[PDB]
Amino acid sequence: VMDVMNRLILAMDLMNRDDALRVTGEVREYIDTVKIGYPLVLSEGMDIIAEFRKRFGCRIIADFKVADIPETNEKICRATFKAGADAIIVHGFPGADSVRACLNVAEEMGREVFLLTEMSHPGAEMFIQGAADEIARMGVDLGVKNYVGPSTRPERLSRLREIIGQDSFLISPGVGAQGGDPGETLRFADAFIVGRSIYLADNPAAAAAGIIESIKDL
Amino acid sequence: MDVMNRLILAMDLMNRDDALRVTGEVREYIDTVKIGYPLVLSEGMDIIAEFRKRFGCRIIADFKVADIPETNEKICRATFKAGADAIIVHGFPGADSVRACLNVAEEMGREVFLLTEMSHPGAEMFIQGAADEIARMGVDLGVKNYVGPSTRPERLSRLREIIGQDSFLISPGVGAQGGDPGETLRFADAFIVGRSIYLADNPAAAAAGIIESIKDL
Numbered sequence: 450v451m452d453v454m455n456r457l458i459l460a461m462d463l464m465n466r467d468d469a470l471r472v473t474g475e476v477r478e479y480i481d482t483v484k485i486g487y488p489l490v491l492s493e494g495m496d497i498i499a500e501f502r503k504r505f506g507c508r509i510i511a512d513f514k515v516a517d518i519p520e521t522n523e524k525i526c527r528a529t530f531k532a533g534a535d536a537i538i539v540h541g542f543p544g545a546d547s548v549r550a551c552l553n554v555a556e557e558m559g560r561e562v563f564l565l566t567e568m569s570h571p572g573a574e575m576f577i578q579g580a581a582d583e584i585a586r587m588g589v590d591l592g593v594k595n596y597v598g599p600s601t602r603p604e605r606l607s608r609l610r611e612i613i614g615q616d617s618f619l620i621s622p623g624v625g626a627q628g629g630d631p632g633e634t635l636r637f638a639d640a641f642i643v644g645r646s647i648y649l650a651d652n653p654a655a656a657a658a659g660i661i662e663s664i665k666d667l
Numbered sequence: 668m669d670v671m672n673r674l675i676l677a678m679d680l681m682n683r684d685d686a687l688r689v690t691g692e693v694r695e696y697i698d699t700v701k702i703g704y705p706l707v708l709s710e711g712m713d714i715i716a717e718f719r720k721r722f723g724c725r726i727i728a729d730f731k732v733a734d735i736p737e738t739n740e741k742i743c744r745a746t747f748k749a750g751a752d753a754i755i756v757h758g759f760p761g762a763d764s765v766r767a768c769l770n771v772a773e774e775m776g777r778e779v780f781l782l783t784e785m786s787h788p789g790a791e792m793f794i795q796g797a798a799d800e801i802a803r804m805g806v807d808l809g810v811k812n813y814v815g816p817s818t819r820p821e822r823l824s825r826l827r828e829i830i831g832q833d834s835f836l837i838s839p840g841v842g843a844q845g846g847d848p849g850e851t852l853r854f855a856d857a858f859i860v861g862r863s864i865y866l867a868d869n870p871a872a873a874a875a876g877i878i879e880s881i882k883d884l
């Protein structure tokens with residue numbers, strides 16, 4: 450499994466190239482794994498992945514929550530890996546064939562797929578939560594090794610860890626701005642994701658260092 | 668929305684030259700193009716403005732938006748800044764995530780299309796069972812544009828029943844996925860066609876034929 454420095458992944462959702470680059474560079478000494486999503490990619494282009502690799506010694510997770518039919522999912526994954534992404538996040542609710550399409554491209558291109566089970570926001574309770582345990586089980590049956598679960602619902606994150614087992618890799622967003630606690634989240638997740646708490650701080654480096662200090666024993 | 672020939676081209680080619688050449692070859696048959704991530708992630712968001720300058724066509728950004736509210740807002744802003752007229756959003760993530768999109772669309776004068784049930788086999792696992800409720804949620808939220816599966820006419824009909832005759836409904840899955848143009852138009856206002864056209868030896872003739880089959884519609 451990837452070695453996430455300090456078990457902390459930066460969710461770089463700033464939409465300005467200059468700001469995204471500045472903030473990421475300022476916390477570079479604390480994080481070697483950055484999650485880049487559509488807010489930044491749709492604002493600056495896929496070349497931003499390359500720019501981040503060139504400037505920082507960071508691993509890149511393309512958070513594209515892939516959720517299309519198998520055929521289109523295949524194209525999305527191919528374009529994303531061609532750009533330099535180490536892994537891609539895929540939604541599990543669209544079904545097994547859509548996930549398998551991503552796993553196939555990741556396999557052939559030598560990259561990784563992260564399967565998003567339950568989400569961290571309030572709305573996730575309407576439809577996703579009820580299908581989450583099965584989506585996770587599906588992922589296990591499909592051979593998925595990397596997963597994403599909600600830090601905002603410790604009981605749910607715990608169950609997801611049980612389903613995927615100790616060997617699977619689990620990352621969890623929702624820490625900070627959404628109310629998730631770093632320490633509690635690490636009881637089940639291999640690493641947690643943090644965006645606004647760091648990138649909106651007057652001193653991102655101090656914010657990141659502070660979060661890490663809170664979990665030094667872990 | 669007035670879709671010419673009730674046909675929406677799904678331009679999923681991943682090469683700028685081919686995408687522009689093929690779209691140009693069938694421009695006389697359409698005025699609405701669906702651009703998704705295959706083309707956008709391969710050529711950049713500037714491709715949207717390029718299409719508007721070249722064809723003046725209407726552009727629906729098929730981004731299957733499916734994140735938390737905060738991120739959904741950013742995605743919609745970046746998308747409409749690029750010139751997209753509408754954006755497609757998943758309903759599965761919940762009401763708050765959809766509302767986030769609706770707010771941005773209203774602010775920038777655009778439309779939100781709610782994807783309820785998908786056309787592929789995997790849609791039967793989790794999506795189909797929640798589809799009717801997702802559609803009802805759209806109604807409660809005031810959504811007026813929807814996306815349903817041409818591959819399951821009975822499901823497409825049910826979606827039309829829920830949203831009513833005033834709502835706008837488009838449907839993918841025609842051609843390559845097995846959907847029939849005429850049958851789909853029994854319930855949808857317009858259907859979406861990708862491969863059957865952009866992978867055809869002669870895209871223009873492919874489009875011409877499809878339109879010929881629904882001439883009476």
Ligand SMILES: O=C1CC(=O)N([C@@H]2O[C@H](COP(=O)(O)O)[C@@H](O)[C@H]2O)C(=O)N1
Nearest residue numbers: 460568569622626643644645734735738
């Ligand atoms: O369930 C989920 C999945 C996810 O990826 N995310 C993403 O994780 C990040 C959370 O950022 P933040 O720390 O709340 O600012 C954003 O990029 C979200 O789009 C989330 O918040 N919830």
Ligand SMILES: O=C1CC(=O)N([C@@H]2O[C@H](COP(=O)(O)O)[C@@H](O)[C@H]2O)C(=O)N1
Nearest residue numbers: 517518521677785786839843860861862
């Ligand atoms: O349920 C759905 C939703 C959707 O948008 N689509 C999209 O519609 C297009 C269908 O193209 P095609 O005619 O099968 O080649 C693709 O761009 C898909 O990503 C789909 O096929 N099924």
